[PDB]
Amino acid sequence: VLAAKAAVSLRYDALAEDRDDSGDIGLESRAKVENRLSQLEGRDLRTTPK
RNA sequence: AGGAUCAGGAAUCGUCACUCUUUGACUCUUCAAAAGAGCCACUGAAUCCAACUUGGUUGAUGAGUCCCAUAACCUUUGUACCCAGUGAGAAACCGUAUGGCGCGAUGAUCUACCCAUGGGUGGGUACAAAUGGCAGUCUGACAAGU
Known part of the structure; x- marks a missing residue:
């Protein structure tokens, strides 16, 4: 990026x-690069149960 | 008199942690399946395509930086060695009654083949060096959320 x-x-x-x-x-x-980074750390590869 | 069954020899602690190992349980799980207290309904969650959304070829995703392309291993061209060491052997007189560098351990002396002690070829070992070999300059289209 x-x-x-x-x-x-x-x-x-x-x-x-x-x-x-x-x-x-x-x-x-x-x-925009920081925004892609901030959208990228927003995601998590774990399981987020309800 | 010497040995083995039922005095010549250390072991009386009301535990706190820490670490390690050990086995057992355990949620699971491969060998590898097979069996399923079975059916409805309610409700929840999760996944997958379609969908939609947001972002994206002004580059979404995928990706062995670091195991060093900053290299390894060679390969050719210029030097240092050795089959540093060897260590006692190298050359034959003397200014105006008398005075000395006339060597040398405190160092004299040298630095596998052919050619009469002049020159070098051959191999191992080390480095400098390569715009040399080995050894040929990434992808590009979806992604993600509900």
């Missing part, structure tokens, strides 16, 4: 002539 978003982030940094130089797209990526 990071190695995905790294390609979205690095090419935002290595290939943009106009650039804020301010880390937004990387943070827009990292918010």
